[PDB]
Design a binder for this molecule. Structure first.
Ligand code: HEM
Ligand SMILES: O=C1N[C@@H](Cc2ccc(O)cc2)C(=O)N[C@H]1Cc1ccc(O)cc1
Length: 394
């Protein structure tokens, strides 16, 4: 006799566990136990994952209710789980959307210059180089400093919170509140800084003084900057890191994109589809009794949407483990979510990876792992799957 199935199955981000395909075929919605001891429904087929994400009766906001079954402990104040809803209710949705588009002036040129500059420094240091710590994460940090309008020099200060902020823990984390309060104070001070006139924070600083927004709290302005820095940097840094592994593992594809850089957008979209950067299913709480497949999910129960369950579903993406640049439904993957909470930084995340991969293949076309792939150290109890170091030669 053995306990219920425990999630997550594996912290490894370079291969999908064989357990996923067996669940999807036999039990596409199945009861599991989370690290807090709570029971939850895990949803692993394309059809059921999309149904859950498009039905607003499965609520993100309500996962923060006291006494709800939990996937993990909150590392933010409970109101911040409703971050996007708080933004829209204060009338700030359009303003935030336009600050994070990759079409901001000089932003693509900044991304390319910063990428090339990071790679030159790696080249002059000599091999081996760490493509996570000395390329992907700094490129992500620099990009979000620029998007936010804050000094590049403050990037590493704010990045320091992220190894704790995005932890996937069974219990509350004392350090997370310390860093949160300190980071909120930093962004509050940015709003009072007359030199901050560009980017998201520059725009928020001027809306703050506009009569149409005089009843929006200073707390919310500062929260927008912390949350968008944190979610954007950890999501873009982690995706680009694990996308470089899938590329290194496929030298034919690596060579094709080097000779034909026009295929990089199509390649990045497949790298998004097969990416394993999210370490847990997306949590939602049922606010009603709702039929999902063969199971009646009851009000108050937790449902977990497994992104790789949908994205590797052979009924929607035939030969799902293969990168194919000519699929007829290329953007229909769930790497950015779906429905109400679709990622607002999808365009920016796509552009970060395209420019990073393009710069890498032009400077480092023979890039390869400097250690056997089994030697990578995968971070555990974290909301993203990432190797601690990514040593490469070229
Ligand atoms: C490759 C990069 C990225 C990936 C794979 C990614 C993935 C995702 C996914 C799957 C969700 C939905 C979560 C859910 O429904 O529970 C989401 C939401 C979100 N993302 Fe992204 N994201 C990326 C980049 C970004 C960037 C660049 C930003 C901002 C600078 C950002 C900010 C947000 C925010 C604030 C939400 C919450 C949206 C809401 O609650 O309505 N993300 N992301
Ligand atoms: O809880 C939230 N918190 C912030 C994201 C966030 C989480 C932790 C943190 O330290 C900073 C930001 C939000 O914008 N919305 C929600 C939902 C969310 C959670 C994780 C994630 O990766 C994206 C969205």
């Amino acid at each position: 006799a053995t306990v219920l199935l425990e999630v997550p199955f594996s912290a490894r981000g370079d291969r999908i566990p064989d357990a996923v395909a067996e669940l999807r075929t036999r039990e596409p919605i199945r009861k599991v136990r989370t690290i807090t001891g709570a029971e939850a429904w895990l949803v692993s087929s394309y059809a059921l994952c999309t149904q859950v994400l498009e039905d607003r009766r499965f609520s993100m906001k309500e996962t923060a209710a006291a006494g709800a079954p939990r996937l993990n402990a909150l590392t933010v104040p409970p109101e911040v789980v409703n971050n996007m809803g708080n933004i829209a209710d204060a009338g700030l949705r359009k303003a935030v959307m336009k600050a994070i588009t990759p079409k901001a002036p000089g932003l693509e040129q900044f991304l390319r210059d910063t990428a090339n500059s990071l790679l030159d420094n790696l080249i002059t240091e000599g091999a081996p180089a760490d493509l996570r710590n000395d390329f992907a994460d700094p490129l992500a940090t620099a990009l979000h400093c620029k998007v936010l309008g804050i000094p590049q020099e403050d990037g590493p200060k704010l990045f320091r919170s992220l190894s704790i902020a995005f932890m996937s823990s069974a219990d509350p984390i004392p350090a997370a509140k310390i860093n949160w309060d300190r980071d909120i104070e930093y962004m509050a001070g940015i709003l009072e800084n007359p030199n901050i006139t560009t980017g998201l924070m520059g725009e928020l600083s001027r809306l703050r003084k506009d009569p149409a927004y005089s009843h929006v709290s200073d707390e919310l302005f500062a929260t927008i900057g912390v949350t968008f820095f944190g979610a954007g940097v950890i999501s873009t840094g982690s995706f680009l890191t694990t996308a470089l592994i899938s590329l290194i593992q496929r030298p034919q594809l690596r060579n094709l994109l080097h000779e034909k850089p026009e295929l990089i957008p199509a390649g990045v979209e497949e790298l998004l589809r097969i990416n394993l950067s999210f370490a847990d299913g997306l949590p939602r709480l049922a606010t009603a009794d709702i039929q999902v497949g063969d199971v009646l999910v009851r009000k108050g129960e937790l449902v977990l949407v497994l992104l790789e369950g949908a994205n590797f579903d052979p009924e929607h993406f035939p030969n799902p483990g293969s990168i194919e640049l000519d699929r007829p439904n290329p953007t229909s993957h769930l790497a950015f979510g779906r429905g109400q909470h679709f990622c607002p930084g999808s365009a920016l995340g796509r552009r970060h990876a395209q420019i990073g991969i393009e710069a890498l293949l032009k400077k480092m076309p023979g890039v390869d792992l400097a250690v056997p792939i089994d030697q990578l150290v995968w971070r555990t109890r974290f909301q993203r799957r990432i190797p601690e170091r990514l040593p490469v030669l070229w």
